[PDB]
């Protein structure tokens, strides 16, 4: 079993895609292994670049292919070189971009956290062993951080490991554990912006519809409720086409469903108050109960919302 | 005719286009069959990557040509690699990325449920026979489902089958049928997020917009039903720019309409019950009889639009 | 000149791009004629697939390129294939997938119907001619249609024709004509979502906006207009979004420019029904006359439209 | 000096981008020139096709490179071909599909004007000569134009002139200027559409937000103001969403800016009326006055920005 | 250490992508070195251009590959050449296009500036060293800058320098040090655009909304303050579709955030008025205070932003 050194140079994460839960990694492959001596011109170590690559491995040179499991498309690598060393060492090296897949939970959208992994493995060897895998993900850590869109907490873990392949053909007696070297990076959302520009608004606009209250009539308090209930609409609008798209409700979702039962909550005890006492009273211990008391129970339900 | 053995291994279902009818498929196809044996080194099977595949086939090696028969468009393929057993079979692996296409109905939007189907054929022999076909769709069943936007029902279905070619040359006497391999995954639409973030709202609006009636004056029914108007076309917008585009009506559609046609019949009511009775009599036995009526023809119509 | 039998197989024809006026088709094409006979492996018609096929070319084989005249970039190719015939027939057969453009008025928008042509020639070649085309739309007539986007009228017309380019080189005595096939698909699209979801609510506020005549006051009148006027706004929004993008008005569009007209001249009836009779008398043998009149004032215009 | 006859036919021109200023260009490139006579097959002129043209170029024939220098990444060739004459005249002819660049002026946006261009220039060598250039866009003059977006004034102008590049290698004593082909074809756009459905109806509600004035109360004065307010910030979403991204301000948007303009001013004058008097006096000399002047002082304005 | 000259000429930078902090460049790439001398055809320097060039590189010629640190994906590289000379210089000279990251800072979004940088490196030796770096960003800085987007303000920088790579193998003594060419181009973004159609009305809807204070009746200021709280909305959502998308506040949404503040404060203080006197009075000295003072707040509360 060949013994290969890889390392990863991780140059920037982005673009990431939550519809598809997809993000974008750009950087360098390099692997490292030790085959039969060489000679080379002179005796220093020969370098051969991109399309000179494939005119080695027709006359016979083994380049074993390692794919991304969990990319998304074929990647796209910039620049590839070898490195030929005279004592049988091998070094590969080669830019790439690429789109990488994993499972992705944005439930808790502002504030949410998520890990960008990737999950190298030889595409037809088992009979060859990653040795040690070293990642640079030296993007900083102490340099832009709160203006940054997330968080990087800590250096990228590395765990090399060994998978088995059951459904296999019936010639291998044995063999058929692969090397696959998964790395990982945790970050944690920024959630400066939306809450200043998104959840802060949001606040504001179910606050002053707790103002329907302070209205003196009864024809004052129920048709203000209507254009309260069209802002909570056009809200819920002007969110959802910045935001990102997703197959369920995030944070702000359950504000702006909260939303819509305030308003309809407030429609409901409006109409509640005039017809609720007998001959026309109109229960104004009721209004200027809930005046503030329909403040208060929206923010004990939000606590349960945390439960 | 040659006994094919494929595998299909799918990784990941995404990316469904309604306006196109498409779906992306990620994962690995494996072919295998058995042909004249061969002079390996020493005698382990070889094992022959990417480029250098073209290599064998210029020196002979005859390796048909698959076609997905409802894909669209070329498919990215990955890497791909032979196996070159002594024996004389040989096994083709290819990881790829392709967008397929099914007849698919949307028109019960938040609940239905579709079929992916993949399509696999020789391109160029009949002469030749898929002998059978293993795909191992080993998504989750029972790990994040409430969670994932599709739910897969069972295990995929598969049916090798043979389709006759009439419109051919005229130089084959009987032999116009191929090989096709047809794999179906049933799944079902979660619609968790459309019903609490489009259709819970809508109802609310829908069922606050029968509150017009408990307004006194006939100037407040009529002038207050132009801005319930103006919020059931607001609705129809924020649900058109989030949900996908379609050539036909949904259900959340249908209660638009439903909605449009709530608030004009409650205009004309409300007209109707002003000028309906002699003298500028109001008939207020109907403004309250609908005040409750209105609500309950809705729900009325409501199970027959299930019928 | 040699004989150059061609088919189409068209499997699907769709996204209609209206800005561009272009639309994609997905099938096969195949090519036959006969040459000098040729020794074949034993004697059986002889596959020659992909990458092999241009090894074939650079030892002589003679084989024509066909462009797609109308297309919009280089088609996309699929699997293609060459069988050769051992008494000197040679037969190419290719999947494609390539944007084509042709000139499409979309004025009648929701009503409107197209026709998909194909224009197939040879490159280089007018010593060569195209001895017949049969096509084989056989995509569905009478299976899915009301479901379908696009209603397919009858089978495909075909029409070889020849073409005169006059601005050639100065060698050519009289050898400037080539041989063009040109197969025509009509084709007329559903407008029954556009009806529900669209055109139908846009009647019921154009008619619900006459309704503001039946408002007692006059300040009743002139305010709930722009309210109206606001919703025929935002009405214009709706459509605009969803509905394609195209540099003429289409029908829809004229039903909206109608709705800004009617408002408008309710706002100057209103005004003028006001401030036209002397000593401040409202004219109310117009507000109740053009009640009923303003509909039908509509429906006389909307005739004419139709002239 | 080499002499190089091109020829530029030209199928569509679309696409047009304003916030990167590019446009797609659909057609084909000819060039002829004579080189060393040569013998053919029999003693007519050999067709050469795509992927065999590079083998004639391995084998040592002259075929220089021509860019075009205003293109904005590698256009599209289609198919290619070489016609060799046996008295030495090479014809180079293939269809492509490139964008290219031209700075283009959008500041009138409704009623501009564009001219689209081309320039070819050789990728290497000085000692090279264009001799004429000879451009066929064919495309319609008298056939559709009011249907069409665009309006082609005349036929295209050509230019083939010299440009000196100075910052050079220093072993060129004087050989530093190369043969540019210019192609020039001026198009006027067609307002027609962007006329009826957004200049028209933002008219409309700058001219009805003047109504404002025949309001009696003070009051219904500033109140209404708002709700055109709104319906001003509403029409000027729904032109932005459709119309296109620009570094700057059009013409439709001059008139979006006179429209806040004319309801701030209104605003104002609405305000001023009221406490402008000593003791509560209405200055009603001054709302029927602006009555007609308002419109007025909009009309006076708005031709002084044609100055 | 061979001595390498480059030269980047600069045709347009365009399409800033500021979701993922992007750039592309348009234009040409020159590098000279001398090698040992060579036979050419005669003796003057031979062209070798695009395909012709790798045929040099497999009979042994050297071409170091120089790569872009800063590029996003492999670039696209229209015509190539190389320029043989006898004396032993080479130049080669490459048409590219390609997209650059570098960190930029768009908070203060309408006035901000920024400087395109470039990186370039060799991608596999440092025993070879790039002699100096020209280029030639010649594009305007005096003909149409009012009318473009973007503001050139000097010359660009050039910086070669020296960059120390640590990680690396074993077998290197002292050899980890680059030649790394910098460029950077500095520019301010033109927010006449962004002033008159954005930061304008935003001001004036502002501005409009103190004006809810000179309203006579209670009930008129409150109900009044939620139409001018759902135009904030709108108009926040007219911004944020046509604005770029970023991860942080700009000037423009801290203007919408303090006019939601401004319209919150308004309803607070509307409602704090009616209720802070005994008995009901009305406190007529805050509104008309408030009446000029809110004004004045909001102007003083912005000179601290720019603190």
């Known amino acids: 079993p060949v013994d290969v050194s890889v390392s990863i140079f991780i140059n920037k994460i982005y673009g990431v895609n939550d519809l598809e839960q997809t993000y974008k990694v750009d950087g360098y492959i390099v692997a490292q292994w030790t085959g039969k001596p060489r000679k080379t011109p002179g005796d220093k170590p020969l370098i051969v670049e991109n399309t000179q690559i494939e005119r080695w491995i027709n006359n016979g040179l083994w380049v074993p292919a390692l794919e991304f ?29 690429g789109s990488f897949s994993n499972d992705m939970d944005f439930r808790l959208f502002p504030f949410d956290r998520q890990q960008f992994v990737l999950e190298l493995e030889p595409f037809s060897y088992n009979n060859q ?24 907490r800590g250096k990228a873990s590395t765990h090399i490991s060994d998978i088995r392949y059951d459904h296999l053909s019936s010639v291998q007696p044995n063999q058929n554990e692969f ?33 329907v209250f302070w209205l003196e009539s009864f024809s004052e308090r129920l048709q203000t409720s209507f254009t309260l209930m069209l802002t909570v609409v056009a809200y819920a609008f002007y969110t959802s086409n910045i935001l990102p798209r997703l197959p369920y409700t995030t944070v702000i979702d359950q504000m702006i469903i909260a939303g819509y039962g305030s308003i309809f909550a407030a429609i409901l005890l409006i109409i509640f108050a005039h ?13 200027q109960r809930c005046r503030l008391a329909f403040p208060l129970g929206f923010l004990a339900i939000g606590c349960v919302l945390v439960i």
Chains 1, 2, 3, 4, 5 share one sequence.
């Open 129 to 152: 062993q990653l040795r040690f895998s070293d990642i640079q993900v030296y993007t900083e850590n102490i340099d832009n951080e709160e203006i940054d869109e997330w968080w990087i």
């Open 275 to 287: 017809h609720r006492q007998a001959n026309g009273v109109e229960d104004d211990l009721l209004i």
């Open 179 to 211: 090397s696959r070297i998964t790395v990982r990076i945790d970050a944690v959302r920024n959630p400066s912006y939306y809450l200043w520009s998104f959840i802060l608004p949001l606040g504001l606009i179910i606050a002053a519809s707790w103002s």
């Open 69 to 97: 499991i969990n990319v998304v498309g074929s990647p796209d690598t910039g620049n590839k070189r070898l490195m030929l060393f005279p004592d049988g060492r091998v070094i590969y090296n080669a830019r790439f971009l």
